[PDB]
Amino acid sequence: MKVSVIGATGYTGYELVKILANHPEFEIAALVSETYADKMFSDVYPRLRSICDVVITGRDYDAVAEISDAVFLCLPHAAAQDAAAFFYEKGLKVVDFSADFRLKDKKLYEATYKVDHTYPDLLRKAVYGLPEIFEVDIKKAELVANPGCYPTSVITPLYPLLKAGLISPEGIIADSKVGVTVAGRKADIAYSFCECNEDFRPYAIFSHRHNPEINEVLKETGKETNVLFTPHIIPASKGIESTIYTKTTAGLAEISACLKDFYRERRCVRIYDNGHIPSTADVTDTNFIDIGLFVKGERLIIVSCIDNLIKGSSGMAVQNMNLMCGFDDTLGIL
Amino acid sequence: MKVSVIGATGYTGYELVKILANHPEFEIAALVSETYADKMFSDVYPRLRSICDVVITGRDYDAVAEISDAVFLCLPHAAAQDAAAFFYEKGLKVVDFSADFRLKDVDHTYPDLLRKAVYGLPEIFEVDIKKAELVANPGCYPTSVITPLYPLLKAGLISPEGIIADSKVGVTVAGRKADIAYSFCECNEDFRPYAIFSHRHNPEINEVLKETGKETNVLFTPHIIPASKGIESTIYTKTTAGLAEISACLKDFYRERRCVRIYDNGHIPSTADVTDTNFIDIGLFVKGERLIIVSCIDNLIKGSSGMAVQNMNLMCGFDDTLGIL
Ligand code: NA
Ligand code: NA
Ligand code: NA
């Protein structure tokens, strides 16, 4: 099966190509980048020399659609909508890395971006690609909205606890931290080495687009949540750690059993209830999500770690494409 | 004036010696590091070659008392108690870096001395520090949390309940220790929480905040940054007041304290803004009934050695920012 990557020279595209080169079913057709067209992919990433030397092509979406059965969209806001619309109408399967199709409520989209959605009819066909929760919907999908990296680390541990009513839906605080790769492959001074090295900073206080995504997805548990989310930048390349504060009516063993029962068949989910504390190094360069549970009285603290570029992006995207194409979601990953 | 440093070769003593070398009134008499005795301080830290070449001496506390008017104790627990008792009985001013004398409330060896100890947060308890002989230096984490919270609780502009402090520190928090958990290869590119529900600084924060008359139950969770220095504390509180009144309460309380830099305009402090300085940067953000405070310090300076020089300045009748600003 032929797949193409639009915006292939970014960091999410690099991590995607690494997985795709070893995937037993997906064959790389085209890698699209206007900046690096006509260059080999290994010219941009010499680490992949002799592993993936595919010549990068420009944004000729017509030629891409003729040689591809499915497409990964590693494109920024708005540009992702245009590409998703084009390749969807050509009959291809589409995984969109952007946030543009994650909020199915148009009024919530407009509340977040202050503008209308450009393809509202296409929006109603998008499925939220959190593979360990919405697998049934994803298998029936043609357009998948790849979840955000932060929401992946927060929704995954919270969803089964709220569904079973073991924690309060009110007052949840998610204090999350990410490596600099969250910005993507950018030349801006804000993401230069000398500005980011040795620096740790919060950002997007009261205003990050992932906050509405988190609360809108947790609605599906039947509980209305008002999760407060605050992101931070780590002076490291990759990794997310989310320290999540909740109120609980259950103890450590009951909370642990709820999470381990819900994800019993999911080999990418590693849950700890023995005092082990996950860190970003435990999940960097893997597709795992590590969840640590800690209970004192009526307070539950969850530590949730992922590689933002893999389980938070490209690895989760391969899981979604696997599900849409009838394969096991972990095929080519584990 | 003559001052000495006990346990001077740690990172806190390193930052302390940097300040003392350029201090107009404090004159270094002895730098005590027992594992490094008979080496020059610049042998351990070559950056200070030609700046502080003082020969490190051993554990001769009688000799230190002979030549010193005051002493900084950068010692671990228990050892800090004995040294603090010795130099107090000899009539010296003492700033203890450890936690042995912070909490006025496994029994304390010197309980009568504990009652004389003053909690050395210079911008809050300056009145009591000017009259003290023994000052307990606050911890680095509590300094970043207590400073923005104390005026708001005292004015009743935030709720004392449900406060959450999610704090992050560079690896220098561990000190100059031989330990695999603090090696470069184990800490590089890694970010981790630790001491969940169990860090010793959590009780310190709540005990000091009681002085406002409000009973707090701050929940504090620390994290290790893959960087050398800096603390960032994201503090979550509930409030019914506006940003203007929260901002005005903090700026009025710290009006003449030049090391406190308070922002209310959307500026977000970061650890790079305060690293290698004695400043504490505080950013204020209000949406509805939620106040988010961003508090940053250098954990080795404003969180430790710089704050200690403020406390020693105050005890010695000097301006608290002397030798710092
Ligand atoms: Na680093
Ligand atoms: Na782990
Ligand atoms: Na900054």
CB of A240 closer than 8 Å to CB of A150: yes
Beta carbons within 8 Å of B134's beta carbon, 6+ residues apart: B84, B88, B94, B96, B101, B113, B116, B117, B118
Could you tell me which of A309, A273, A304 has the C-alpha nearest to residue A289?
A304
The alpha-carbon gap from A259 to the nearest alpha carbon of chain B, in Å, equals 20
User: Taking chain B, what is the end-to-end CA distance rounded to the nearest angstrom?
Assistant: 19
CA of B68 to the centre of ligand 3 (A): 40
| Residues whose CB falls within 8 Å of the CB of residue B301, separated by 6 or more in sequence, listed in order | B15, B276, B277, B278, B307
Q: Which of A175, A245, A246, A302 to mutate to test the interface with B (most CBs of B within 10 A)?
A: A175
| Burial class of residue A1 (count of CB atoms within 10 Å of its CB; 0-12, 13-18, 19+) | middle
Q: Are B229 and B275 in contact (CB under 8 A)?
A: yes
Picking from B269, B243, B242, B300, the residue whose alpha carbon sits closest to that of residue B18 is B300
> Across the interface, which of B190, B275, B294 has its CB nearest the CB of A280?
B190
CA B80 to CA B100: how far, in whole Å?
A: 7
Indicate the SS3 state at residue A53: coil
| A232–B190 C-beta distance less than 8 A | no
B219 phi/psi in degrees, rounded to 5 = -100, 125
From B159's Cα to the closest Cα of chain A, the distance in A is: 14
Inter-CA distances, B152 with B146, B196, B204, B244, B293, Å: 10, 26, 18, 12, 11
Instruction: Label residue A54 exposed, middle or buried (CB < 10 Å: 0-12, 13-18, 19+).
Output: middle
Partners of A237 on chain B (C-beta within 8 Å) are 189
- The one-letter code for the residue type at B3 is V
Q: How many A from CA of B311 to the centre of ligand 3?
A: 28
Distance CA B116, CA B97 (A): 16
Breaks, C-N > 2.5 A, in chain B lie after 105
Give the residue from chain B lying closest to A297, CA to CA.
Answer: B197
Residues A55 and A89: their CA atoms lie apart, in Å, by 26
- Phi, psi of B69, rounded to the nearest 5 degrees: -95, -25
Neighbours of A105 (CB within 10 A): 13
Q: Which residues line ion ligand 3, judged by CB < 5 Å?
A: B 270, 272-273
Q: Which residues contact A226 (CB under 8 A, 6 or more apart)?
A: A169, A170, A171, A172, A215
B321 CB neighbour count, 10 Å cutoff: 16
Q: Please give the Cα distance from A298 to A295 (Å, whole number).
A: 7
Contact B234 A175 (CB under 8 A): yes
Q: Which of helix, strand or coil describes residue A311?
A: helix
Query: What gap in Å lies between CA B204 and CA B200, rounded to an integer?
Result: 7
Return the structure tokens found at B305.
């050695």
The secondary structure of residue A40, as a DSSP letter, is B
- Among residues A74, A149, A196, A268, which one is catalytic? A149
> H or E stretch including A30?
strand A27-32
Find where tokens 């947790």 sit.
A218
- Residue B74: which residues within 8 A CB-CB, separation 6 or more? B5, B6, B7, B8, B10, B12, B13, B16, B97
C-beta of residue A245 within 8 angstroms of C-beta of residue A172 = yes
Are A291 and A42 spatial neighbours (Cβ–Cβ below 8 Å)? no
C-alpha to C-alpha distances, A73 to A88, A101, A325, B267, nearest whole angstrom? 12, 12, 17, 34
Burial of A139 (0-12, 13-18, 19+ CB in 10 A): middle
Asked if A17 and A5 touch (Cβ cutoff 8 Å), the reply is: yes
φ, ψ (nearest 5 deg) of residue B135: -115, 125
Q: Ligand 2 mean position to A180 CA, how many Å?
A: 21
Q: How far apart (Å, rounded) are the C-alpha atoms in residues A181 and A14? A: 12
Name, in order, each residue with C-beta under 8 angstroms of A63's C-beta and a sequence gap of 6 or more: A30, A57
d(CA B101, CA A298): 31
Q: Is A206 left (phi over 0), alpha (psi -120 to 50) or beta?
A: left
* Closest Cβ–Cβ partner in B189, B292, B294 for A236: B189
**Exposed (0-12), middle (13-18) or buried (19+): which is A121, by Cβ within 10 Å?**
exposed
Residue of B nearest to A244 (CA): B166
Give the Cα separation of A248 and A158 in Å (integer): 12
Give me the residue label for tokens 């919405």: A134
Please, what's the b/e burial string for A252-277 (b: 16 or more CB within 10 A of its CB; e: otherwise)? beebbebbeebbeebebbbbbbeeeb
Write out the two tokens for B8.
Answer: 């001077």
Query: Do the Cβ atoms of B234 and A238 come within 8 Å?
Result: no
**Bridge partner residues of B32 (DSSP):** B6, B57
Residue B187 CA, ligand 2 centroid: distance in Å? 14
> How far is the CA of B284 from the CAs of A128, B124, B127, B247, in angstroms?
35, 19, 27, 7
Residues of chain A in contact with residue B223, where contact means CB-CB under 8 angstroms, are: 177, 241, 243
Gap from CA of A198 to ligand 2 centroid (Å): 24
SS3 A157: helix
Contacts of B275 in chain A (CB under 8 A): 198
Residues in chain A: 334
The amino acid present at B238, given as its one-letter code, is K
Of B221, B223, B294, the CB nearest to A301: B221
Angstrom distance (rounded) from CA A266 to CA A101: 25
How many C-beta atoms surround the C-beta of residue B177 within 10 A? 9
Q: Which uninterrupted H or E stretch holds A257?
A: helix A252-262
Give the ligand whose atoms come closest to the C-alpha of residue B192.
2
| Coil, strand or helix at A4 | strand
**Chain A contact set for B168 (CB, 8 A):** 177, 200, 232
Q: Are B133 and B94 in contact (CB under 8 A)?
A: yes
- What Rg, from alpha-carbon coordinates, does chain B have? 19
Question: Among B113, B211, B91, B203, which Cα is nearest to B154's?
Answer: B211
Closest residue on chain B to A296 (Cα) = B197
- DSSP label of A189: G
Question: What is the 8-class DSSP label of residue A313?
Answer: I
CB atoms within 10 A of CB A74: 29
**Per-residue tokens: A154:** 């927060």
Farthest CA pair distance, chain A: 61
Q: Which amino acid is at A297?
A: G
Chain-centroid distance of CA B88 in Å reads 21
Asked if A175's CB is within 8 angstroms of B232's CB, the reply is no
Q: How far apart are the CA of B166 and the centre of ligand 3, in A?
A: 19
Instruction: Enumerate the β-bridge partners of residue A304.
Output: A242, A291
HEC readout, chain B: CEEEEECCCCHHHHHHHHHHHCCCCCEEEEEECHHHCCCEHHHHCHHHCCCCCCECECCCHHHHHHHCCEEEECCCCCHHHHHHHHHHHCCCEEEECCCCCCCCCCCCCCHHHHHHCEECCCCCCHHHHCCCCEEECCCHHHHHHHHHHHHHHHCCCCCCCCCEEEEEECHHHHCCCCCHHHCHHHHCCCCEECCCCCCCHHHHHHHHHHCCCCCCCCEEEEEECCCCCCEEEEEEEECCCCHHHHHHHHHHHCCCCCCEEEECCCCCCCHHHCCCCCCEEEEEEEECCEEEEEEEECCCHHHHHHHHHHHHHHHCCCCCCCCCC
The radius of gyration computed from the CA coordinates of chain A, to the nearest angstrom, equals: 19
Q: Residue A197: CB partners within 8 Å, gap ≥ 6?
A: A235
Cα–Cα dist B325/B322, whole Å: 6
Tell me which chain B residues have a C-beta less than 8 angstroms from the C-beta of A193: none
Yes or no, beta carbons of A236 and B164 under 8 Å apart: no
Please report how the helices A210-218 and A106-113 are oriented relative to each other, as an axis angle in degrees rounded to 10: 160
Q: Which residues in chain A touch residue B196, judged by CB atoms under 8 angstroms apart?
A: 277, 294, 301, 303
Verify whether the Cβ–Cβ distance B225 to A234 is below 8 Å. Answer: yes
Query: Is position A258 annotated as part of the catalytic site?
Result: no
